[PDB]
Subunit: 143 residues, 4 copies
């Protein structure tokens, strides 16, 4: 429910979302705690359940580049679930936070049983890709 | 190894192993067009990906003025309607055979049986799509400034 | 160094061009909580923040404000509205007391009429943004 | 629009006298079928408007794959942003027919703006709109 309040999982039914929740782990942050640092290995997504999380980078002059504030029911590290890679930002608790995490290693076991879910996940991610490279302009003019 | 190389010269199936490529190939259907045949019409329901194996397909779209604007010319080893395999929806272009064309097609409907036979494929397909969506959004403009 | 030249748009201006741009601008002071502009307001003005911080936010489909950026000293707001006026797509709010320098689209032609090297510099800067875009970036 | 110059978003704002001047200040270029206008990677500093004939733009892929990109006909622009920000040609241009073009180079820009100072804001609007609608399309940030 908190879990289906995002486009990735918004297509799941009660049974499927109940199973997803049981595949996930509970994560707690105190205010000011770091969830991860830019460049850390990332192989998991989070759904925020309560509190707020800040994502930033830092410019070569030393100034914070503030990228987002992620609140209840929003995703962190969505694409890490499918394609693990270095974190592109540092995540920092602004408040007492609760999240649910799903790791890349938990993906295959969840999907082995449920190929109905794999297709729903593929539809979700492909919907997003569709709009991106469509928007991603022309210059087919040899500028 | 070189068996299904034609199916791997693209950002979707590039990482498939030889066995997965064999399953992909067995799952596909052969299509052959004569010159001037239309593969599909813009606006048609679309739920298939194609890999052209010979000939050329011109993709085109109807102009605000009634003419067809050229969009692409697709030849051997290139894909048509890639994301429609995962997210069926109306065709945004007409594909017209410029020559004798042969293609291999995979439909949305063929995906589930393949994933059921080979569950690792779901993870591999999710990886491939996530990778590109990543490059588009991340490796790539800003102006979060209001204007 | 120069608060106006720490952005890709005006970076290539020399000392005297920056000074004359600055003399052509309007200073704006905001108290904490003041709104610089509302989403949907006519937008025809670029700002450079010179002190404090401005939060840019957009109304989310669920009705919460969604933060797009926080803009600090040396950073731009409304850059493209200087050249191509149109509705503001975000609300800007002062998180602190804020001072800015503003240049409006109405000021642009008076400034450029006698400064063709500046105009060419600005065109290069905008175009380069397009070039690097596509240097980083269908099926039917 | 009958004007071979004002059928594109870049120059579409201009009035009759400023287009005629612009035209007479551009250089005429002639290509025979099979001529190369430019090679992908070549330094570029000018835009062209095709006045007659057709130019194929194609770029080259991993295996050495000549990859078709556009066919540019009369009243259409080639290398638009090369005028403002000279850099490497993103494609090869090959004449499909005998072709005629008008060329405007980066070096012709400052003298033009000296004679016609108000043109600067019209070009800025046009390039900024290209950039804005992109940004408007985009702005589709979670640590990845």
């Amino acid at each position: 429910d908190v879990l289906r309040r995002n486009p990735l999982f918004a297509a799941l039914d009660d049974e499927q979302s109940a199973e997803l929740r049981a595949s996930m782990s509970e994560v707690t942050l105190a205010r000011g705690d770091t969830l991860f640092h830019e460049g850390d290995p990332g192989d998991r997504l989070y759904v925020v359940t309560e509190g707020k999380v800040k994502l930033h980078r830092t410019s070569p002059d030393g100034r914070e580049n503030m990228l987002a504030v992620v609140g209840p029911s929003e995703l962190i590290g969505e694409l890490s679930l499918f394609d693990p890679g270095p974190r592109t930002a540092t995540g920092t608790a602004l408040t007492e936070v609760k999240l649910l995490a799903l790791g890349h290693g938990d993906l295959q076991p969840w999907l082995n049983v449920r190929p109905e879910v794999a297709t729903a996940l593929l539809r979700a991610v492909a919907r997003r890709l569709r709009k991106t490279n469509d928007a991603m302009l022309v210059f087919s003019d040899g500028s």
